[PDB]
């Protein structure tokens, strides 16, 4: 699929799982579904900062259905970025360890 162009709304509070990963549930507000969800993490200065996706491939099947995303964020302070463009969801996260 092509990358989603639309906006995302956070559906639930971001949650830490038992094993140092985060569960992010988002709701899509676009017209181009199905599409792949832009998902990344940055540091404070906007630098791309490494990690891995537990969720296979984040895809919006139905814009009325929220999508779950499990990820292993970098350690310490980062920003989880869902979507792209001016309306990109930018969420602060701290991972202890």
């Amino acid at each position: 699929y092509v990358m989603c162009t639309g906006s995302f709304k956070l559906e639930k509070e971001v949650a830490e799982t038992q094993h140092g990963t985060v569960l992010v549930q988002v709701k899509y507000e676009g017209t181009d579904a199905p599409c792949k969800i832009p998902f990344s993490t940055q540091d404070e200065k906007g630098a791309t900062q490494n990690g891995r996706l537990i969720t296979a491939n984040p895809i919006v099947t139905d814009k009325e259905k929220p999508v779950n995303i499990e990820a292993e964020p970098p350690f310490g302070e980062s920003y989880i970025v869902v979507g792209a463009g001016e309306k990109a969801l930018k969420l602060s996260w701290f991972k202890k360890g």
């Epitope: 200065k45 906007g46 791309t48 970025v81 792209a84 463009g85 001016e86 990109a88």
Partner: antibody
Framework: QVQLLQPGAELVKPGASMKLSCKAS????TNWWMHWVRLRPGRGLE????????????KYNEKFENRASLTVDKHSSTAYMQLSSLTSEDSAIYYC???????????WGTGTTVTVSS | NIVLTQSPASLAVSLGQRATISCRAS??????????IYWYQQKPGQPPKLLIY???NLESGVPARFSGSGSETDFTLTIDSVETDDAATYYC?????????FGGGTKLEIKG
């Protein structure tokens, strides 16, 4: 329609300092990061740094860090890039570019042809 | 720094024929399953213009003849049928890690 306007040319002496302007229009200036990139003849494109005009957070290419300064003026929606201790190696076309977060550069400035000469 | 090497330095393609430009990275530009790499087009007297993002996605307004592919360290830009206005220099760029780096540029000419 988005426009990033820069002066066409600057002529500065070696060792001197320069301050380049990028005047944004057509959008909410503080909603997008601004990057700076230069093009040298036969040497390609080089990334200088980025700044968030909203919060003044920034990051430099280490090659330019001791020598460069990124600033904005929210009031006039203008971003500035200052580079000092200029040599002939800094003669280039300097572009400011808007960040399509967190990926590519969607809008490029008009460009400022900079000549470092005695 | 991630080094991006483009090939060839320049090339000429007969009008209507296929063109291919490659970009090779000194290490991975993948971030959460996406390639943080971009292709820009620049013509003389003009600032660059984005064509392809995340290796394979077409920017709106860009003709369908443009396509890109690859992952990790090997990427290609393809124009399956060149036209006159496709003559330009093409640059790949990564932002998978600071500082952002650009490829050396590939200059495409058109015959006919």
């Amino acid at each position: 329609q988005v426009q990033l306007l820069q002066p066409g040319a600057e002529l500065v002496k070696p060792g001197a300092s320069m301050k380049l302007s990028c005047k944004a229009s057509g959008y909410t200036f503080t909603n997008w990061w601004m990057h700076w990139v230069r093009l040298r003849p036969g040497r390609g494109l080089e990334w200088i740094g980025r700044i968030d005009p909203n919060s003044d957070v920034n990051k430099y290419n280490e090659k330019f860090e001791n020598r460069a300064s990124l600033t904005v003026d929210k009031h006039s929606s203008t971003a500035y890039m200052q580079l000092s201790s200029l040599t002939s190696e800094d003669s280039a076309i300097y572009y400011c570019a808007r960040w399509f977060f967190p990926w590519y550069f969607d809008v490029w400035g008009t460009g400022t042809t900079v000549t470092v000469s005695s | 720094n991630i080094v991006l090497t483009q090939s060839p330095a320049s090339l000429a393609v007969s009008l209507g024929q296929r063109a291919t430009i490659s970009c090779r990275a000194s290490e991975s530009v993948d971030h959460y399953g996406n390639s943080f790499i971009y292709w820009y087009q620049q013509k003389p007297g003009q600032p660059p213009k984005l064509l392809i993002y995340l290796a394979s996605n077409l920017e709106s307004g860009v003709p369908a003849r443009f396509s890109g592919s690859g992952s990790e360290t090997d990427f290609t830009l393809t124009i399956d049928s060149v036209e006159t206005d496709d003559a330009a220099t093409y640059y790949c760029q990564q932002n998978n890690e600071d500082p952002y780096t650009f490829g050396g540029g590939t200059k495409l000419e058109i015959k006919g």
